[PDB]
């Protein structure tokens, strides 16, 4: 459902940042905002 993929997207945002892809992490951050604004 929606909660599983939200968690996997959150985890990829964190992993991207820890592995030195900060710019990519910020892009996934934007997706998390847009995704959670939906019904």
């Amino acid at each position: 459902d929606k909660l599983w993929i939200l968690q996997k997207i959150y985890e990829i945002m964190v992993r991207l940042d820890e592995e030195g892809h900060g710019e990519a992490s910020l892009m996934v951050s934007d997706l998390i905002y847009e995704f959670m604004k939906r019904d």
Partner: protein
């Protein structure tokens, strides 16, 4: 008495957007043409105009300041939505003042990432205009209460920007100053430099 705008625009450290700083400017004279003429990437006034400012007097001026991403500067406008306008800093539909921004990559980016600047990624509802939320409660994204511990669908609500100089310009830090021009039924003691 010269208004302390230099202390706002040329301050050494800026606030994180979620904990944006406000400075009340009062009882002073300000030359606004000196502002409009540093290199600025945004400069838009809403209830006023820059040239017209140097002849007006106001009760107070409020200067709000913070750092956001370049692509987020467009959200600092009336009627905007987005991660910054919804959850960090919200202007009202009837805003009277100016929004000023500039690229601060040289100051606010660091090799390996500057994690001192934060934004709020999660919030149950949108901010009211000029509301300030500095809470750090774990955000409950799912059905189970988080009980103060981050975990599955339980997220710490703030993120660091991690600004690095190699970022694209849309991901680089921008310093933003929002000027609110307040006119109450009271003496107008903040006056443009060509005030009568």
């Amino acid at each position: 008495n010269l208004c302390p705008f230099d202390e706002v625009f040329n301050a050494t450290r800026f606030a994180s957007v979620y904990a944006w700083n406000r400075k009340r400017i009062s009882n002073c004279v300000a030359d606004y043409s000196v502002l409009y003429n540093a290199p600025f990437s945004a400069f838009k006034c809403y209830g006023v105009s820059p040239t017209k400012l140097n002849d007006l007097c106001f009760t107070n001026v409020y200067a709000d300041s913070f750092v956001i991403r370049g692509n987020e500067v467009s959200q600092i406008a009336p009627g905007q939505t987005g991660n910054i306008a919804d959850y960090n800093y919200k202007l009202p539909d009837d805003f009277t003042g100016c929004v000023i921004a500039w690229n601060s990559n040289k100051l606010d980016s660091k090799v390996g990432g500057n994690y001192n600047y934060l934004y709020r990624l999660f919030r149950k509802s949108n901010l009211k205009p000029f509301e300030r939320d500095i809470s750090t409660e774990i955000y409950q994204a799912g059905n189970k209460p988080c009980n103060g511990v981050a975990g599955f669908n339980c997220y710490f609500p703030l993120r660091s920007y991690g600004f690095r100089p190699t970022y694209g310009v849309g991901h680089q830090p921008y310093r933003v100053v929002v000027l609110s021009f307040e006119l109450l039924h009271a003496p107008a003691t903040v006056c443009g430099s060509n005030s009568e």
